[PDB]
Design a protein around this ligand. Structure first.
Ligand SMILES: [Mg+2]
Ligand SMILES: [Mg+2]
Ligand SMILES: [Mg+2]
Ligand SMILES: [Mg+2]
Ligand SMILES: [Mg+2]
Ligand SMILES: [Mg+2]
Ligand SMILES: [Mg+2]
Ligand SMILES: [Mg+2]
Ligand SMILES: [Mg+2]
Ligand SMILES: [Mg+2]
Ligand SMILES: [Mg+2]
Ligand SMILES: [Mg+2]
Ligand SMILES: [Mg+2]
Ligand SMILES: [Mg+2]
Ligand SMILES: [Mg+2]
Ligand SMILES: [Mg+2]
Ligand SMILES: [Mg+2]
Ligand SMILES: [Mg+2]
Ligand SMILES: [Mg+2]
Ligand SMILES: [Mg+2]
Ligand SMILES: [Mg+2]
Ligand SMILES: [Mg+2]
Ligand SMILES: [Mg+2]
Ligand SMILES: [Mg+2]
Ligand SMILES: [Mg+2]
Ligand SMILES: [Mg+2]
Ligand SMILES: [Mg+2]
Ligand SMILES: [Mg+2]
Ligand SMILES: [Mg+2]
Ligand SMILES: [Mg+2]
Ligand SMILES: [Mg+2]
Ligand SMILES: [Mg+2]
Ligand SMILES: [Mg+2]
Ligand SMILES: [Mg+2]
Ligand SMILES: [Mg+2]
Ligand SMILES: [Mg+2]
Ligand SMILES: [Mg+2]
Ligand SMILES: [Mg+2]
Ligand SMILES: [Mg+2]
Ligand SMILES: [Mg+2]
Ligand SMILES: [Mg+2]
Ligand SMILES: [Mg+2]
Ligand SMILES: [Mg+2]
Ligand SMILES: [Mg+2]
Ligand SMILES: [Mg+2]
Ligand SMILES: [Mg+2]
Ligand SMILES: [Mg+2]
Ligand SMILES: [Mg+2]
Ligand SMILES: [Mg+2]
Ligand SMILES: [Mg+2]
Ligand SMILES: [Mg+2]
Ligand SMILES: [Mg+2]
Ligand SMILES: [Mg+2]
Ligand SMILES: [Mg+2]
Ligand SMILES: [Mg+2]
Ligand SMILES: [Mg+2]
Ligand SMILES: [Mg+2]
Ligand SMILES: [Mg+2]
Ligand SMILES: [Mg+2]
Ligand SMILES: [Mg+2]
Ligand SMILES: [Mg+2]
Ligand SMILES: [Mg+2]
Ligand SMILES: [Mg+2]
Ligand SMILES: [Mg+2]
Ligand SMILES: [Mg+2]
Ligand SMILES: [Mg+2]
Ligand SMILES: [Mg+2]
Ligand SMILES: [Mg+2]
Ligand SMILES: [Mg+2]
Ligand SMILES: [Mg+2]
Ligand SMILES: [Mg+2]
Ligand SMILES: [Mg+2]
Ligand SMILES: [Mg+2]
Ligand SMILES: [Mg+2]
Ligand SMILES: [Mg+2]
Ligand SMILES: [Mg+2]
Ligand SMILES: [Mg+2]
Ligand SMILES: [Mg+2]
Ligand SMILES: [Mg+2]
Ligand SMILES: [Mg+2]
Ligand SMILES: [Mg+2]
Ligand SMILES: [Mg+2]
Ligand SMILES: [Mg+2]
Ligand SMILES: [Mg+2]
Ligand SMILES: [Mg+2]
Ligand SMILES: [Mg+2]
Ligand SMILES: [Mg+2]
Ligand SMILES: [Mg+2]
Ligand SMILES: [Mg+2]
Ligand SMILES: [Mg+2]
Ligand SMILES: [Mg+2]
Ligand SMILES: [Mg+2]
Ligand SMILES: [Mg+2]
Ligand SMILES: [Mg+2]
Ligand SMILES: [Mg+2]
Ligand SMILES: [Mg+2]
Ligand SMILES: [Mg+2]
Ligand SMILES: [Mg+2]
Ligand SMILES: [Mg+2]
Ligand SMILES: [Mg+2]
Ligand SMILES: [Mg+2]
Ligand SMILES: [Mg+2]
Ligand SMILES: [Mg+2]
Ligand SMILES: [Mg+2]
Ligand SMILES: [Mg+2]
Ligand SMILES: [Mg+2]
Ligand SMILES: [Mg+2]
Ligand SMILES: [Mg+2]
Ligand SMILES: [Mg+2]
Ligand SMILES: [Mg+2]
Ligand SMILES: [Mg+2]
Ligand SMILES: [Mg+2]
Ligand SMILES: [Mg+2]
Ligand SMILES: [Mg+2]
Ligand SMILES: [Mg+2]
Ligand SMILES: [Mg+2]
Ligand SMILES: [Mg+2]
Ligand SMILES: [Mg+2]
Ligand SMILES: [Mg+2]
Ligand SMILES: [Mg+2]
Ligand SMILES: [Mg+2]
Ligand SMILES: [Mg+2]
Ligand SMILES: [Mg+2]
Ligand SMILES: [Mg+2]
Ligand SMILES: [Mg+2]
Ligand SMILES: [Mg+2]
Ligand SMILES: [Mg+2]
Ligand SMILES: [Mg+2]
Ligand SMILES: [Mg+2]
Ligand SMILES: [Mg+2]
Ligand SMILES: [Mg+2]
Ligand SMILES: [Mg+2]
Ligand SMILES: [Mg+2]
Ligand SMILES: [Mg+2]
Ligand SMILES: [Mg+2]
Ligand SMILES: [Mg+2]
Ligand SMILES: [Mg+2]
Ligand SMILES: [Mg+2]
Ligand SMILES: [Mg+2]
Ligand SMILES: [Mg+2]
Ligand SMILES: [Mg+2]
Ligand SMILES: [Mg+2]
Ligand SMILES: [Mg+2]
Ligand SMILES: [Mg+2]
Ligand SMILES: [Mg+2]
Ligand SMILES: [Mg+2]
Ligand SMILES: [Mg+2]
Ligand SMILES: [Mg+2]
Ligand SMILES: [Mg+2]
Ligand SMILES: [Mg+2]
Ligand SMILES: [Mg+2]
Ligand SMILES: [Mg+2]
Ligand SMILES: [Mg+2]
Ligand SMILES: [Mg+2]
Ligand SMILES: [Mg+2]
Ligand SMILES: [Mg+2]
Ligand SMILES: [Mg+2]
Ligand SMILES: [Mg+2]
Ligand SMILES: [Mg+2]
Ligand SMILES: [Mg+2]
Ligand SMILES: [Mg+2]
Ligand SMILES: [Mg+2]
Ligand SMILES: [Mg+2]
Ligand SMILES: [Mg+2]
Ligand SMILES: [Mg+2]
Ligand SMILES: [Mg+2]
Ligand SMILES: [Mg+2]
Ligand SMILES: [Mg+2]
Ligand SMILES: [Mg+2]
Ligand SMILES: [Mg+2]
Ligand SMILES: [Mg+2]
Ligand SMILES: [Mg+2]
Ligand SMILES: [Mg+2]
Ligand SMILES: [Mg+2]
Ligand SMILES: [Mg+2]
Ligand SMILES: [Mg+2]
Ligand SMILES: [Mg+2]
Ligand SMILES: [Mg+2]
Ligand SMILES: [Mg+2]
Ligand SMILES: [Mg+2]
Ligand SMILES: [Mg+2]
Ligand SMILES: [Mg+2]
Ligand SMILES: [Mg+2]
Ligand SMILES: [Mg+2]
Ligand SMILES: [Mg+2]
Ligand SMILES: [Mg+2]
Ligand SMILES: [Mg+2]
Ligand SMILES: [Mg+2]
Ligand SMILES: [Mg+2]
Ligand SMILES: [Mg+2]
Ligand SMILES: [Mg+2]
Ligand SMILES: [Mg+2]
Ligand SMILES: [Mg+2]
Ligand SMILES: [Mg+2]
Ligand SMILES: [Mg+2]
Ligand SMILES: [Mg+2]
Ligand SMILES: [Mg+2]
Ligand SMILES: [Mg+2]
Ligand SMILES: [Mg+2]
Ligand SMILES: [Mg+2]
Ligand SMILES: [Mg+2]
Ligand SMILES: [Mg+2]
Ligand SMILES: [Mg+2]
Ligand SMILES: [Mg+2]
Ligand SMILES: [Mg+2]
Ligand SMILES: [Mg+2]
Ligand SMILES: [Mg+2]
Ligand SMILES: [Mg+2]
Ligand SMILES: [Mg+2]
Ligand SMILES: [Mg+2]
Ligand SMILES: [Mg+2]
Ligand SMILES: [Mg+2]
Ligand SMILES: [Mg+2]
Ligand SMILES: [Mg+2]
Ligand SMILES: [Mg+2]
Ligand SMILES: [Mg+2]
Ligand SMILES: [Mg+2]
Ligand SMILES: [Mg+2]
Ligand SMILES: [Mg+2]
Ligand SMILES: [Mg+2]
Ligand SMILES: [Mg+2]
Ligand SMILES: [Mg+2]
Ligand SMILES: [Mg+2]
Ligand SMILES: [Mg+2]
Ligand SMILES: [Mg+2]
Ligand SMILES: [Mg+2]
Ligand SMILES: [Mg+2]
Ligand SMILES: [Mg+2]
Ligand SMILES: [Mg+2]
Ligand SMILES: [Mg+2]
Ligand SMILES: [Mg+2]
Ligand SMILES: [Mg+2]
Ligand SMILES: [Mg+2]
Ligand SMILES: [Zn+2]
Lengths: 71, 59, 204, 118, 5, 131, 122
RNA sequence: GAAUGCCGGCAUGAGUAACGAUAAAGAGGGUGAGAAUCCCUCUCGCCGUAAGCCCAAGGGUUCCUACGCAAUGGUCGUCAG
RNA sequence: CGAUGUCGGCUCGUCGCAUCCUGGGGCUGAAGAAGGUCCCAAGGGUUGGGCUGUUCGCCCAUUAAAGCGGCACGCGAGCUGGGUUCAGAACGUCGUGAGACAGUUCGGUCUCUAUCCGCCACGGGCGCAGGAGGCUUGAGGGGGGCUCUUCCUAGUACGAGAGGACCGGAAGGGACGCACCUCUGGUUUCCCAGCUGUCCCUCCAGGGGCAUAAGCUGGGUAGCCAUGUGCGGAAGGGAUAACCGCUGAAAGCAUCUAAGCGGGAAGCCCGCCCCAAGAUGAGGCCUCCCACGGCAGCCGGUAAGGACCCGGGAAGACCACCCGGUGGAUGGGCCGGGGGUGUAAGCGCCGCGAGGCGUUGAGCCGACCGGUCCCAAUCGUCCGAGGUCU
C-alpha cells in the first residue's frame, strides 16, 4: 500500500442529490507500473475501494504470472 | 432575478426620514427694471416684454 | 527636495541620439514664494508656491491680504512643496537639469461612473453560450452565510479618475529656460491644460 | 464619457436630427423669429449662421450649397436678396437666442426665441 | 423549475 | 499661453525642410541610416508611398515594396534624422489618399491603377531647369 | 504577434511548409511571439523527402510578422506574412537556405547564421 | 389577536417600475379661462400584395350635426369610438 | 420538509499553512554543480492546451513553480445548465404484465423592479462658541509587495574528468499594476469622397430623401482607447524567525544565557503611492471682517464673505467639483492655422460617346491650437458676525 495511491471523487450517471455530492468513485494506482483500476459499481466508497484494490491485485498478479511464463 | 420584495413595512418615521430631501425650492425671481414686476432672471419679462433695456416682444 | 508648480502643455517626441523620445511638455515656472512654513511656526518645513498671474478684480479681500503680506501680485494657484526651502524668492525651471529624475503629480482624467471592467480590469461575462445580460457584470460579490457580508474595499463599479496620481522616476529630457518649458520622458497624469507638480524623484 | 465632444443629440438619430435642424432653418429664415426649446435654439444658431454666411458670399456654388439644406429656391432667393444684404459688414453672429420666462404646460419645457439680428 | 430529487 | 505654439516651438529644432514633396502613389527611394551590429551604413528602401498621415512635425509616411517574394511595408517619420535623403523615382496618380487596396492587387493591376502622373512629372522636369 | 494556433510559413528548405505555433518560448507565460523569439510548433504541412515531416514537434525562430514591429528610431516594419526558420536546440538553423527577407532584429538577438543566409535584411 | 380565516377600509413598497412596438418630428396661424397633445398651413418621416380599397362574419348607433369635458382616454384635451 | 436550489464550469475573491515556487536556515551517505531531509517564512506568485458534463485523472508544450485545504465541498435574488433531477423515445436487463434500473442512449420552460444590513460611489444636514477665504499637520486607513535569463567576476575555487560555484557587478525579459495618446493600431451615426436602385426639386447640369436605428463602399480629426508609450515592485533605516555566535556563571570543565552584547529572512515596523481632523481627541498656519440698531435668548439692517441665476467645462447620472459672467474670450458665430478628404461647381478644350484634360491640391470641411465682443453670460436677489462661562 506504500506504492499504491487511492483517489476518491464524485461518480457518474444517476443518483440525484446523492450522486451529486458523494465521493463514491475510487481510483487505485500502482505507482511503479502506473496501471490503475477505477470502480463506482456501488454507492459506497468503501465497497468500491475494496473491489478496486482486489482487481488491482488480480491484474498485477496476472502481469507477474505472465512475465514468469515468458521466462 | 428572484423577485426582490420588501422584507418589512417601512415605518412612518422612516418613510418620512426619506422625504427629508423633497421640499421644493421657491423659484429664483428678480425685479424687471422696466415695469418692476417679479420675474426669473435672465429671461424676457413676460409682463412688459423688455430685456436688456429694449423691447423684445409683444405681450 | 526641490519642486515647482506647472501646467501640462501636451505631448510630442524628439530625437536624441538616433532615438525617438516620447515626451510630455510642462510649462513649469515661474513660481513666486508666497509663504514659508517653518518648524518654529508651523511644525514642519515647506514652501507655499504661487503660479499663474491673476486679475486682481477676482481676488477677494482675505486673499489680497495674504498676497500683500508677501509682496506678491495675485496668483491663481497656491500649492506647497514639502521639505523645500529655496534660497531666492522665485522658483523656476532651472532647479532641474537634463538627466535628473522627477516625480510628477496630476489630476487624472475622469471616467465618471466607471464599470467594473474599465475600473478594475474585471473579465466581465461571456458574450455567447447563453450568458444572460451579464456581459460586463462582476459576478459573485461574496460567499454565503459565512461571513454573510461583503468586505470593505471590495472592487465594485463607481467613479474612477479625476483623482491625485503621481507618476514616479520620470526622466528630464530638456529644460528650455527661455520659455519655462520642461520636457519629461513619458506620460503625466491628467489633461492638457491641467495643473501638475514636479518634484525631485524619491527613487535612488 | 463625452470629453471634448461638440454637438447635442436631442434624442434623435442622425437623419432625424439633421432634418430637425433643416426644418428649423426653414422656419427661421421664413419668419425671422421662432420660439422653440432652449437647447434646440442654441443649436440652430450655428446651423443657420453658416447658411447666412454662404449667402453673404453670393456665388453660385454657395447657393447650390445652401439649397442642399433649405431646398426652397424662393426661400433661398429671400436669403440671398433680402436677408444676406443686411449682414455685409457684420462678422458672424447673425442670430440671437433669448430665454422666455414661462414653461410649456404639458411637459414643462423651458422655451426661448431664436431670431435674426438687425 | 429545478428540483431536489 | 498658446499650448499649440509651445509644442510647435519645442518641435521646431528638429524640423527638416530638405526633403522633396511626394504624394501617395509616388514611387520613392528612402536612404536610411541603419546600425549594423557595430557600424552605420545607408540602406536604401524603394517602393510605392501608400500612405501619408499628417500631424505637423509628427507626420509619418508608409512605403510598400515586394522584396524577394514577400511584401514589406516600412513606416518612416517624415522628419526623422535617420533619413539621409529621399529620391523621387516615379510620380504615380492615385484617386484616394490611402492606397491600402494595392496589397490585394497583382503587379499588372497596380500598373493599371497608378498610372504615371504626367502633370507632376512635367512639373518635376520643368524644375531643375533652373541653372 | 504569434500565439498558439497561429500558422506560420517556413522560410527555409527543410521541407516544412506550414508550422502551427503551440508555445511561445519566452518565460513562464508570454502571450505573443515577435521577431527573434523562439516558438515550439508542430509541422502541419511539408513536402516529400524533406528533413522535417508532417507531425514533428520542432522549434523555430520568428523571422517575419504581419503585425508591424516598432523600433527605437521611431520607424516600424511590416511583412506580408508570418514566417519562421526551423532551428535546433542550440538555436542554429536546420535547413541550408533562408527564403525571403528577415527582420534586422534577428541580428541583435544571436541569429547571425540566419541573418547571413537571408537574401535581404530589413 | 392570530384559523396562508371572512367582508370592508386604509397603509408599505413609492413619487419608485411603468405610461403598450425606435415609422419622427419642426415651426407658423387660429380657437379657448387653459393648448407639445384640438383646427388650418408649410416643412420632415412612415406604409403602399398595405399600415390603401371593396365584401362576408361578428359588433349593434359606434354613423352625421350642434352643445359639452365630471368620469372614460395610460399625459394633456378646447379633442374623441 | 406552510422549501436551507442541489455537480461541474464562469466570474469575483478572501482566509488557513501541514509551503509548490521565490527568501533565510541546520543535517547530509553535502567536493563543485545538482539533490535528499528537516526547520523558519503565507509577502507575492502559482501558464496555455488535447480527452471527458465531469470533479478527479491521463497526455502535449512550457515554467521559478505549475501547492493542498476552508469559506452552506465559497459564490444560480451573479451567469451558465453539459451532468444530476419529472413527463417522450429506444437499447441491454429484470418482470406473465402494468412497469423497473448508482445501467446506457437522444430530447427536455432556470422568475424585468432590492425594503433592511453589507459593499462601491456621490451628495444634503448639523456639529467643530465669532463670522469668513485660502494653505496645510497626519492619528488612523488603504494600495503595492512576483520572478527568470544572459553576461562579467571565471572557465576561476572545486573536480581524475565531465561538469562548475560562493561573494560581488552589469544587461535584457514574462506576467501584473498605475497613468498616458507623442508614435504604432483601433474606433470615430455624417468630417470628406465614390456607388447602386428609386422618388423628387427643375428639363439639362447640380442636388435632396429613402434603402438601418449610417443604403453601400473607401477613408478619417479630436475624444475614448491597447495591440502602443512611460513608470512601478525598491533602495535604505529599524526590530525579529529558524539558525549562527561573543563574553559567561550556576556546575574549578563545559555551556549563545541564567547578567549582558552581536549576526540573521521575499516576512514584521518605518520608508513609497493614495485616502484621511465626524481624529465629536472635530488639530495647526496665513489672511480678511468686526464691539450695528431694537424689549450664552429673540429680532431687525449690514461686515468679510457666501449662495441664487446665467455662459460653460477631458468635472459629472442628479448632486458635487472647476472656470467665466460685458471691468468678459465662457459657449455660439466669424477669421487664421491644424486635420481629414483628395483636384467642388462653373467654364474652356479634346472625344460620335461613356469620358478625359485644364482652371485646381481645388472645393467641402465635427470636436484640435489660437484670434476676434459679431451673438449670447441682461438686469439683479437673498443669506450672511457683534462672539457664553471659568
Ligand atoms: Mg496515504
Ligand atoms: Mg458521486
Ligand atoms: Mg456520462
Ligand atoms: Mg432513477
Ligand atoms: Mg453524502
Ligand atoms: Mg435569478
Ligand atoms: Mg437572471
Ligand atoms: Mg432573466
Ligand atoms: Mg422583479
Ligand atoms: Mg418579514
Ligand atoms: Mg417597505
Ligand atoms: Mg412598520
Ligand atoms: Mg404608514
Ligand atoms: Mg427610509
Ligand atoms: Mg408624518
Ligand atoms: Mg425618494
Ligand atoms: Mg418648500
Ligand atoms: Mg537633447
Ligand atoms: Mg493634471
Ligand atoms: Mg481631470
Ligand atoms: Mg468627464
Ligand atoms: Mg483601470
Ligand atoms: Mg480593460
Ligand atoms: Mg474574459
Ligand atoms: Mg476568460
Ligand atoms: Mg470579453
Ligand atoms: Mg452579447
Ligand atoms: Mg437561458
Ligand atoms: Mg441577469
Ligand atoms: Mg446579450
Ligand atoms: Mg462592467
Ligand atoms: Mg454579476
Ligand atoms: Mg444563503
Ligand atoms: Mg448557494
Ligand atoms: Mg457575519
Ligand atoms: Mg470626482
Ligand atoms: Mg529606469
Ligand atoms: Mg512660455
Ligand atoms: Mg493638483
Ligand atoms: Mg487652471
Ligand atoms: Mg463610459
Ligand atoms: Mg457612450
Ligand atoms: Mg467644446
Ligand atoms: Mg451633428
Ligand atoms: Mg431617448
Ligand atoms: Mg426617443
Ligand atoms: Mg426621453
Ligand atoms: Mg436613415
Ligand atoms: Mg415654413
Ligand atoms: Mg408675426
Ligand atoms: Mg412654437
Ligand atoms: Mg421642440
Ligand atoms: Mg449665378
Ligand atoms: Mg435669456
Ligand atoms: Mg426658467
Ligand atoms: Mg401634460
Ligand atoms: Mg396641456
Ligand atoms: Mg497640440
Ligand atoms: Mg511594385
Ligand atoms: Mg481606375
Ligand atoms: Mg486610369
Ligand atoms: Mg494630372
Ligand atoms: Mg516553404
Ligand atoms: Mg519528408
Ligand atoms: Mg498530415
Ligand atoms: Mg500524417
Ligand atoms: Mg532552417
Ligand atoms: Mg517564401
Ligand atoms: Mg389566541
Ligand atoms: Mg381559514
Ligand atoms: Mg378575507
Ligand atoms: Mg363600503
Ligand atoms: Mg378586499
Ligand atoms: Mg381584505
Ligand atoms: Mg384603498
Ligand atoms: Mg400607497
Ligand atoms: Mg396599495
Ligand atoms: Mg407611499
Ligand atoms: Mg424622483
Ligand atoms: Mg426602490
Ligand atoms: Mg430607478
Ligand atoms: Mg412595472
Ligand atoms: Mg422611467
Ligand atoms: Mg410596456
Ligand atoms: Mg410608445
Ligand atoms: Mg417594428
Ligand atoms: Mg428596432
Ligand atoms: Mg415602419
Ligand atoms: Mg422622439
Ligand atoms: Mg420647423
Ligand atoms: Mg411641434
Ligand atoms: Mg405643431
Ligand atoms: Mg404650436
Ligand atoms: Mg393641447
Ligand atoms: Mg390645455
Ligand atoms: Mg390637425
Ligand atoms: Mg407596389
Ligand atoms: Mg351584419
Ligand atoms: Mg363590443
Ligand atoms: Mg353610446
Ligand atoms: Mg374629460
Ligand atoms: Mg376642465
Ligand atoms: Mg380633463
Ligand atoms: Mg357636465
Ligand atoms: Mg381617464
Ligand atoms: Mg386625462
Ligand atoms: Mg390604456
Ligand atoms: Mg373651449
Ligand atoms: Mg367619428
Ligand atoms: Mg426539507
Ligand atoms: Mg411561506
Ligand atoms: Mg418560511
Ligand atoms: Mg418558500
Ligand atoms: Mg425562502
Ligand atoms: Mg511552519
Ligand atoms: Mg525554500
Ligand atoms: Mg533555500
Ligand atoms: Mg537544505
Ligand atoms: Mg552544493
Ligand atoms: Mg531541522
Ligand atoms: Mg506566501
Ligand atoms: Mg478542456
Ligand atoms: Mg479539436
Ligand atoms: Mg478535465
Ligand atoms: Mg474520471
Ligand atoms: Mg528551481
Ligand atoms: Mg518540476
Ligand atoms: Mg493545467
Ligand atoms: Mg480558494
Ligand atoms: Mg457548494
Ligand atoms: Mg471548490
Ligand atoms: Mg453554488
Ligand atoms: Mg447566492
Ligand atoms: Mg438560476
Ligand atoms: Mg452552480
Ligand atoms: Mg436566491
Ligand atoms: Mg444572490
Ligand atoms: Mg439568496
Ligand atoms: Mg439537461
Ligand atoms: Mg440544453
Ligand atoms: Mg411532476
Ligand atoms: Mg430485450
Ligand atoms: Mg412474477
Ligand atoms: Mg420477458
Ligand atoms: Mg423469472
Ligand atoms: Mg434492473
Ligand atoms: Mg435510467
Ligand atoms: Mg454506480
Ligand atoms: Mg442516461
Ligand atoms: Mg442506449
Ligand atoms: Mg432539439
Ligand atoms: Mg440525458
Ligand atoms: Mg425578464
Ligand atoms: Mg434601498
Ligand atoms: Mg436587516
Ligand atoms: Mg447603507
Ligand atoms: Mg457632509
Ligand atoms: Mg467660532
Ligand atoms: Mg475654508
Ligand atoms: Mg496632508
Ligand atoms: Mg499613518
Ligand atoms: Mg476611525
Ligand atoms: Mg501601511
Ligand atoms: Mg515584498
Ligand atoms: Mg569563464
Ligand atoms: Mg577568484
Ligand atoms: Mg565545459
Ligand atoms: Mg549573482
Ligand atoms: Mg497583485
Ligand atoms: Mg493611481
Ligand atoms: Mg490602465
Ligand atoms: Mg489618456
Ligand atoms: Mg486611459
Ligand atoms: Mg492615435
Ligand atoms: Mg492626437
Ligand atoms: Mg486619437
Ligand atoms: Mg493611427
Ligand atoms: Mg455633412
Ligand atoms: Mg440629372
Ligand atoms: Mg439619389
Ligand atoms: Mg419620400
Ligand atoms: Mg418609404
Ligand atoms: Mg427608416
Ligand atoms: Mg442589412
Ligand atoms: Mg447619406
Ligand atoms: Mg467608414
Ligand atoms: Mg481605420
Ligand atoms: Mg481619431
Ligand atoms: Mg487616430
Ligand atoms: Mg485615453
Ligand atoms: Mg499592450
Ligand atoms: Mg567557563
Ligand atoms: Mg566559552
Ligand atoms: Mg539574557
Ligand atoms: Mg541581536
Ligand atoms: Mg557573527
Ligand atoms: Mg539587525
Ligand atoms: Mg524585491
Ligand atoms: Mg490629502
Ligand atoms: Mg475640522
Ligand atoms: Mg485636511
Ligand atoms: Mg461629545
Ligand atoms: Mg470638544
Ligand atoms: Mg475615537
Ligand atoms: Mg474641542
Ligand atoms: Mg480646523
Ligand atoms: Mg498640530
Ligand atoms: Mg459651494
Ligand atoms: Mg453642465
Ligand atoms: Mg452638476
Ligand atoms: Mg447637470
Ligand atoms: Mg463665481
Ligand atoms: Mg452680474
Ligand atoms: Mg455676481
Ligand atoms: Mg468666446
Ligand atoms: Mg471663439
Ligand atoms: Mg484665460
Ligand atoms: Mg455648447
Ligand atoms: Mg491639408
Ligand atoms: Mg480634373
Ligand atoms: Mg471643376
Ligand atoms: Mg461638371
Ligand atoms: Mg466639371
Ligand atoms: Mg463635342
Ligand atoms: Mg481619371
Ligand atoms: Mg486643406
Ligand atoms: Mg457641406
Ligand atoms: Mg469655412
Ligand atoms: Mg479651416
Ligand atoms: Mg464650424
Ligand atoms: Mg492634442
Ligand atoms: Mg481684445
Ligand atoms: Mg433687476
Ligand atoms: Zn417688465
Amino acid at each position: 500500500m506504500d506504492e499504491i495511491r487511492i483517489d476518491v471523487m464524485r461518480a457518474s450517471g444517476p443518483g440525484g442529490s446523492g450522486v451529486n455530492t458523494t465521493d463514491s468513485a475510487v481510483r487505485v494506482v500502482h505507482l511503479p507500473t502506473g496501471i490503475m483500476v477505477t470502480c463506482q459499481d456501488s454507492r459506497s466508497q468503501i465497497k468500491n475501494r475494496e473491489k478496486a484494490l482486489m482487481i488491482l491485485r488480480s491484474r498485477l498478479l496476472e502481469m507477474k504470472r505472465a512475465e514468469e511464463a515468458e521466462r | 432575478a428572484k423577485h426582490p420584495v420588501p422584507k418589512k413595512k417601512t415605518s412612518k418615521a422612516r418613510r418620512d426620514a426619506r422625504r427629508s430631501h423633497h421640499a421644493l425650492t421657491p423659484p429664483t425671481l428678480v425685479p424687471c427694471p422696466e415695469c418692476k414686476a417679479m420675474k426669473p432672471p435672465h429671461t424676457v419679462c413676460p409682463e412688459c416684454g423688455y430685456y436688456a433695456g429694449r423691447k423684445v416682444l409683444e405681450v | 527636495m526641490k519642486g515647482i508648480l506647472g501646467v501640462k502643455v501636451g505631448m510630442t517626441r524628439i530625437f536624441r541620439d538616433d532615438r525617438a523620445v516620447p515626451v510630455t511638455v510642462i510649462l513649469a515656472g515661474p513660481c513666486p514664494v508666497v509663504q514659508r512654513r517653518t518648524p518654529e511656526k508651523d511644525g514642519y518645513t515647506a514652501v507655499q508656491l504661487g503660479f499663474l498671474p491673476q486679475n486682481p478684480k477676482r481676488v477677494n479681500r482675505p486673499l489680497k491680504g495674504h498676497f500683500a503680506k508677501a509682496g506678491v501680485e495675485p496668483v491663481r494657484i497656491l500649492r506647497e512643496i514639502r521639505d523645500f526651502n529655496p534660497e531666492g524668492d522665485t522658483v523656476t525651471v532651472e532647479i532641474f537639469k537634463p538627466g535628473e529624475r522627477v516625480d510628477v503629480t496630476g489630476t487624472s482624467k475622469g471616467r465618471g461612473f466607471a464599470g467594473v471592467m474599465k475600473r478594475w480590469n474585471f473579465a466581465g461575462g461571456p458574450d455567447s453560450h447563453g450568458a444572460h445580460k451579464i456581459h460586463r457584470h462582476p459576478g459573485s460579490i461574496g460567499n454565503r452565510k459565512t461571513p454573510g457580508r461583503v468586505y470593505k474595499g471590495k472592487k465594485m463599479a463607481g467613479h474612477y479618475g479625476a483623482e491625485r496620481v503621481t507618476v514616479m522616476n520620470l526622466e528630464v529630457v530638456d529644460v528650455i529656460p527661455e520659455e519655462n518649458l520642461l520636457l519629461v520622458k513619458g506620460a503625466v497624469p491628467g489633461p492638457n491644460g491641467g495643473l501638475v507638480i514636479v518634484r525631485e524623484t524619491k527613487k535612488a | 464619457m463625452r470629453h471634448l465632444k461638440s454637438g447635442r443629440k436631442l434624442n434623435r438619430h442622425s437623419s432625424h436630427r439633421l432634418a430637425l435642424y433643416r426644418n428649423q432653418a426653414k422656419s427661421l429664415l421664413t419668419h425671422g423669429r421662432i420660439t422653440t426649446t432652449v437647447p434646440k435654439a442654441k443649436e440652430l444658431r450655428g446651423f443657420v449662421d453658416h447658411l447666412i454666411h454662404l449667402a453673404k458670399r453670393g456665388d453660385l456654388h454657395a447657393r447650390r450649397l445652401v439649397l442642399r439644406d433649405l431646398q426652397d429656391v424662393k426661400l433661398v432667393r429671400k436669403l440671398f436678396d433680402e436677408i444676406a444684404p443686411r449682414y455685409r459688414d457684420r462678422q458672424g453672429g447673425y442670430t440671437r437666442v433669448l430665454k422666455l420666462a414661462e414653461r410649456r404646460r404639458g411637459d414643462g419645457a423651458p422655451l426661448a426665441l431664436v431670431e435674426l439680428v438687425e | 423549475a429545478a428540483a431536489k430529487c | 499661453m498658446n499650448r499649440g505654439a509651445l509644442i510647435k516651438l519645442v518641435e521646431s529644432r528638429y524640423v527638416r525642410t530638405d526633403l522633396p514633396e511626394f504624394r501617395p502613389g509616388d514611387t520613392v527611394r528612402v536612404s536610411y541610416k541603419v546600425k549594423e551590429g557595430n557600424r552605420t551604413r545607408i540602406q536604401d528602401f524603394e517602393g510605392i508611398v501608400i500612405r501619408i498621415r499628417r500631424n505637423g512635425f509628427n507626420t509619418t509616411f508608409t512605403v510598400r515594396k515586394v522584396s524577394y517574394g514577400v511584401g514589406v511595408e516600412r513606416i518612416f517619420p517624415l522628419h526623422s534624422p535617420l533619413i539621409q535623403k529621399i529620391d523621387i523615382v516615379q510620380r504615380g496618380r492615385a484617386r484616394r489618399a490611402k492606397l491600402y487596396f494595392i496589397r490585394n492587387l497583382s503587379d499588372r493591376e497596380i500598373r493599371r491603377k497608378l498610372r504615371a502622373d504626367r502633370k507632376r512629372i512635367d512639373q518635376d522636369r520643368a524644375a531643375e531647369r533652373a541653372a | 504577434m504569434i500565439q498558439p494556433q497561429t500558422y506560420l510559413e517556413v522560410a527555409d528548405n527543410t521541407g516544412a511548409r506550414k508550422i502551427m505555433c503551440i508555445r511561445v518560448l519566452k518565460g513562464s507565460n508570454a502571450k505573443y511571439a515577435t521577431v527573434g523569439d523562439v516558438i515550439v510548433a508542430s509541422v502541419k504541412e511539408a513536402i516529400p523527402r524533406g528533413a522535417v515531416k508532417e507531425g514533428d514537434v520542432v522549434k523555430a525562430v520568428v523571422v517575419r510578422t504581419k503585425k508591424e514591429i516598432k523600433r527605437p528610431d521611431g520607424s516600424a516594419i511590416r511583412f506580408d506574412d508570418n514566417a519562421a526558420v526551423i532551428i535546433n536546440n542550440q538555436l542554429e538553423p536546420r535547413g541550408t537556405r533562408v527564403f525571403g527577407p528577415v527582420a534586422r532584429e534577428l541580428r541583435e538577438k544571436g541569429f547571425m547564421k540566419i541573418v547571413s543566409l537571408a537574401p535581404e535584411v530589413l
